[PDB]
Amino acid sequence: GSAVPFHGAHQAGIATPVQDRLHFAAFDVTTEDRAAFVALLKEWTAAARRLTAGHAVGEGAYGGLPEAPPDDTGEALGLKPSRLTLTIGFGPSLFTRFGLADLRPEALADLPKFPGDNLDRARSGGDLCVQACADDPQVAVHAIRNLARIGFGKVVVRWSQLGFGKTSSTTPDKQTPRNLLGFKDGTRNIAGTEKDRLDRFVWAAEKDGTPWMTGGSYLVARRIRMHIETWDRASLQEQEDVFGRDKGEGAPVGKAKERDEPFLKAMKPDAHVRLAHPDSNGGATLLRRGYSFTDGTDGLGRLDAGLFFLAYQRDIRTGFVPVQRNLATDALNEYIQHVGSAVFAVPPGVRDADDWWGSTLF
Amino acid sequence: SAVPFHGAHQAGIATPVQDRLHFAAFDVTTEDRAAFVALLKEWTAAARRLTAGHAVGEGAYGGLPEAPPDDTGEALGLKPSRLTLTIGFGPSLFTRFGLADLRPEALADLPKFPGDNLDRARSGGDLCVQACADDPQVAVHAIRNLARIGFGKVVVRWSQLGFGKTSSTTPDKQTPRNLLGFKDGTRNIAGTEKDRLDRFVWAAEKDGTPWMTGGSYLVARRIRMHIETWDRASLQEQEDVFGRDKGEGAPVGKAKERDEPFLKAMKPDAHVRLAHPDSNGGATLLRRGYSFTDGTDGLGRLDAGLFFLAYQRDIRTGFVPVQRNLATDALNEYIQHVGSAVFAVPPGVRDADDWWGSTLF
Ligand code: HEM
Ligand code: HEM
């Protein structure tokens, strides 16, 4: 239940160990005054320093003047930090404002249309986002609510997504979680310890072209519905064929252990692992950090389930795009549908107590 | 780590409150009494497996490659996580299978209450399964697999995820706070109070419905909070609405949370004052609800609130009088009841040969 440090060269919440719960929100900016927006960023950074340490924002949740609303809404009182991280990102549409056009990064590429895409524009896009991750879902909701509260009149929430449980791993020494299809998810990811792999595949460099993004990353979010009725009547062999790993151990087909290296030629030509593997993609590698969700029924007598997929990479054009292009023939496509999409530039870390979110851009 | 499944009562009522909830209401699609009893027996077998941390049937893997696995497998490698599974029967169940005359009188239809805004789609249900656990994935896997086993005989009508405390970081003796920032649960029936459970919670034989002896009656209300409006109210307005201060949760005029309230020092329409048993002829409830946050609606607003669950010996003498007395609650300014259901929760599964609903069928 400890705290994750808030300051660093990079923002926490990426290479950090994946916490149990997600509350992700996308925001549209509603002010034209760039000075007001910078003031917002400074105030949000100050709140996040309190929040990530387990402190109430402002002057606290009670004890102030009776006739004023309290600074902090109060529902996280007496809770530990719970490994809360807060990660902010800037959407492509933001750079149409405040005179930022010339500063939008080349690596903040718009996604092309992919086959099967059925994207809902209400749950897509966003001028910016905040990814709140914690082991306690009340801690995460409290942080989103209080950021939105502070930004009233300058930002509004466009759409949000709660993940009730992780389906990713940055800690290969810990148990790999399973997604709602019942398969381990996260075996061959990037570990928060693999410093060289993060430099090569995740962190933006100065040489890459955009100096203010040095130390940041780029985020692709995809809301993906699962056809669980269809999946749940498929045979065990069909399910294992679709992925290329067995269901129980999660081992590559033909091998004994989850972490044995896959031998791709033994997998079906349309197996998900075979098609997603860096070797099939010229070395393209992603940091996967997604969460499972369920949002009630579908109105047709079934549960509604899916995966809120999040990938961090050094450059959307050499990471998510080529891999997703190679999944056009994926056998998994029969059982899923992408229904929400958004990309963000995640800026560098807040260096110390005088720094603030987005300072290198603004 | 696990909660015993068998008992004179079903678990998940008086047993310790777990961190997470997945509540599902089901509608019945079969007219065949025999087919329904068959499913009740199949569900009970699955509940025994699930609550002990085992896969249903012949497992999540290792069976024939050309068959679908008996268990969908997303709980593999997880612990029992204090999973309890509690089943209830809705009044509409008793229009089927010839059971009309077996409906308990204590399973009363709720009156319409001032300010109700009930979504038909997220109300009612032929039956329900309350799945409580410290791991949300354990709870979801339980609902997911019972619905699968029942496919063809029942459909899921509506489902609600909820959270309370996170036990792995919050002390056990600490009152949780609801999403309005106030401690919630201070004056409640505790599972340790066997005499209050007999008086206020468990159905007795002389209550008039023998098959329900050892059962209870459940009211579910999905209560939206108007978060953004609440958060612009002054600290003094918030405390006036409840009759307790926000920091400590002490009744006005006292200094400790568990000090007994002086009701005359609260505002006349304070929530505690109107809800208290002394203002309702002694009517007392076991509250066992969970917070929810489902996302954000079309106007940018937080879709969040309290999934209110109350157990009582008779709906007519528990939930109805108290909710009636809330007609003028100052809290009504900030909440809206948007979903509702009632259920008869049968007595417990006595042993390995017993099954859910055996006393009724
Ligand atoms: C509901 C949607 C998806 C599900 C259920 C799913 C599931 C899985 C599973 C079970 C594995 C094997 C274990 C592992 O190494 O993590 C895996 C691997 C992987 N997946 Fe997916 N996946 C989904 C979507 C995606 C998408 C959209 C992408 C990229 C656009 C992707 C990229 C990858 C990659 C890169 C690997 C690692 C393969 C390797 O390097 O060995 N997945 N996925
Ligand atoms: C969003 C909806 C509600 C919220 C946030 C809420 C909150 C609270 C709070 C903070 C307390 C004081 C602490 C405690 O004793 O638990 C309380 C007490 C109580 N509430 Fe509510 N409540 C809600 C709805 C209801 C409803 C619908 C009922 C019953 C119809 C109810 C019945 C009670 C009772 C019986 C008490 C105990 C009073 C006593 O004996 O001191 N509440 N509630």
Q: Compute the Cα dihedral for A345, A348, A354, A359 and give only its sign.
A: negative
Pocket test for ligand 2, best of B17, B184, B293 (most atoms within 8 A of CB): B184
CB-facing half-sphere around the CA of B326: CA atoms within 13 A = 23
Task: Please state, in angstroms and rounded to a whole number, the distance separating the CA atoms of residues B90 and B113.
Answer: 20
DSSP string, A37-89: HHHHHHHHHHHHHHHHTTPPSTT-SSSS-TTS--SS--TTTT---TT-EEEEE
3-state secondary structure of A172: coil
Task: Please state, in angstroms and rounded to a whole number, the distance separating the CA atoms of residues B225 and B337.
Answer: 9
Report B:311-350 residues touching A (Cβ under 8 A).
none
Nearest chain A residue to B29 by CA: give it: A301
CB A298 within 8 A of CB A304: yes
Element (H, E) at B34: helix B33-51
Beta-strand runs (E) in A118-245: 128-134, 155-163, 165-166, 217-226
CA nearest neighbour of A183 among A116, A239, A137, A135:
A239
Say how many Å lie between the CA of residue B242 and the centre of ligand 2: 9
CA nearest neighbour of A166 among B80, B136, B18:
B136
Domain residue limits at A267: 1-362
Interchain contact, B166 vs A73, CB within 8 Å:
no
Token pair for residue B293? 């946050």
3-state secondary structure of A99: coil
Token pair for residue B70? 């008996």
CB A136 within 8 A of CB A99: no
At position A178, the amino acid (one-letter code) is: R
Q: Are strands A165-166 and A85-90 parallel, antiparallel or unpaired?
A: unpaired
Q: Residue A280: exposed, middle, or buried by beta-carbon count in 10 A (0-12, 13-18, 19+)?
A: middle
> Is A309 labelled as part of a ligand binding site?
yes
B26 phi and psi angles, rounded to 5 deg: -120, 145
Match 């299978």 to its residue by tokens. B97
Interchain contact, B294 vs A299, CB within 8 Å:
no
Q: How far is B154 from chain A (nearest CA, A)?
A: 8
CB A164 within 8 A of CB A135: no
Which ligand is the nearest neighbour of the Cα of A272? 1
Which residues in chain A have Cβ-Cβ distances shorter than 8 Å to B68? Answer: 232-236
Length of chain A (residues): 362
3-state secondary structure of A27: strand
Cβ neighbours, 10 Å, residue A217: 29
Q: Helix A34-52 and helix A137-151: axis angle, to 10°?
A: 160
Q: Is A232 on the interface with B (CB under 8 A)?
A: yes
Interchain contact, A164 vs B140, CB within 8 Å:
yes
Task: Please state, in angstroms and rounded to a whole number, the distance separating the CA atoms of residues B15 and B6.
Answer: 12
> Is A163 labelled as part of a ligand binding site?
no
Name B25's bridge partners.
B128, B158
Task: Please state, in angstroms and rounded to a whole number, the distance separating the CA atoms of residues A295 and B296.
Answer: 12
> Is A188 labelled as part of a ligand binding site?
yes
Task: Please state, in angstroms and rounded to a whole number, the distance separating the CA atoms of residues B102 and B209.
Answer: 8
Q: Is B46 on the interface with A (CB under 8 A)?
A: no
Say how many Å lie between the CA of residue B275 and the centre of ligand 2: 6
Q: Is A230 on the interface with B (CB under 8 A)?
A: no
Say how many Å lie between the CA of residue B4 and the centre of ligand 2: 29
State which approach was used to obtain the coordinates: X-ray
Token pair for residue B9? 């009562």
Domain count, chain A: 1
Element (H, E) at B227: helix B227-231
Interchain contact, B140 vs A178, CB within 8 Å:
no
Task: Please state, in angstroms and rounded to a whole number, the distance separating the CA atoms of residues B36 and B28.
Answer: 9
CA nearest neighbour of B82 among B154, B17, B10:
B17
Q: Helix B33-51 and helix B136-150: axis angle, to 10°?
A: 160
CB-based contacts of B200, cutoff 8 Å, min separation 6: B189, B284, B285, B286, B312, B313, B318
Task: Please state, in angstroms and rounded to a whole number, the distance separating the CA atoms of residues B212 and A265.
Answer: 61
Which residue's CA is the closest to the ligand 2 atom numbered 7? B184
Task: Please state, in angstroms and rounded to a whole number, the distance separating the CA atoms of residues A89 and A313.
Answer: 13
Task: Please state, in angstroms and rounded to a whole number, the distance separating the CA atoms of residues A61 and A49.
Answer: 16
Length of chain B (residues): 361
Task: Please report, for residues A1, A81, A90, the alpha-carbon distance to residue B170 in angstroms, rounded to integers and kept in the order given.
Answer: 9, 11, 34
CB B216 within 8 A of CB B345: yes
CB-based contacts of B196, cutoff 8 Å, min separation 6: B189, B190, B284
CB-based contacts of A223, cutoff 8 Å, min separation 6: A123, A161, A306, A308, A309, A338, A339, A340, A341
3-state secondary structure of B261: coil
Which residues in chain A have Cβ-Cβ distances shorter than 8 Å to B75? Answer: 178
Q: Is A117 on the interface with B (CB under 8 A)?
A: no
Match 């993609």 to its residue by tokens. A281
Cβ neighbours, 10 Å, residue B259: 15
Task: Please state, in angstroms and rounded to a whole number, the distance separating the CA atoms of residues A5 and A48.
Answer: 11
CB of A219 closer than 6 A to ligand 1? no
Q: Give the long-range contacts of residues A184-187, CB within 8 A, separation 24 or more.
A: A184/A245, A184/A250, A184/A258, A185/A288, A185/A290, A186/A18, A186/A288, A187/A245, A187/A250, A187/A258, A187/A259
Nearest chain B residue to A247 by CA: give it: B61
CB of A320 closer than 6 A to ligand 1? yes
Cβ neighbours, 10 Å, residue B263: 17
Task: Please report, for residues B177, B228, B251, the alpha-carbon distance to residue A69 in angstroms, rounded to integers and kept in the order given.
Answer: 18, 12, 20
Task: Please report, for residues A30, A70, B262, the alpha-carbon distance to residue A97 in angstroms, rounded to integers and kept in the order given.
Answer: 10, 32, 57
CB of A276 closer than 6 A to ligand 1? yes
Report A:6-45 residues touching B (Cβ under 8 A).
23, 25
B85 phi and psi angles, rounded to 5 deg: -125, 120
Match 């009730």 to its residue by tokens. A164
Minimum-distance CB partner of A73 among B135, B169, B181: B181
Q: Is A99 on the interface with B (CB under 8 A)?
A: no
Task: Please report, for residues A3, A217, A246, B223, the alpha-carbon distance to residue A241 in angstroms, rounded to integers and kept in the order given.
Answer: 41, 34, 8, 45
Task: Please state, in angstroms and rounded to a whole number, the distance separating the CA atoms of residues A83 and B70.
Answer: 36
Q: Is A66 on the interface with B (CB under 8 A)?
A: yes
Tell which atom from ligand 2 comes closest to the C-alpha of B326: 30
CB B310 within 8 A of CB B200: no
Task: Please state, in angstroms and rounded to a whole number, the distance separating the CA atoms of residues B25 and B163.
Answer: 18
Task: Please state, in angstroms and rounded to a whole number, the distance separating the CA atoms of residues B307 and B222.
Answer: 5
Q: Compute the Cα dihedral for A155, A156, A158, A162 and give only its sign.
A: positive
> Is B51 labelled as part of a ligand binding site?
no
Q: Is A63 on the interface with B (CB under 8 A)?
A: yes
At position A331, the amino acid (one-letter code) is: A
Q: How far is CA A34 from the centre of its chain?
A: 27
> What letter would DSSP give residue B109?
P
CA angle A168, A345, A351 (to 5 degrees): 90
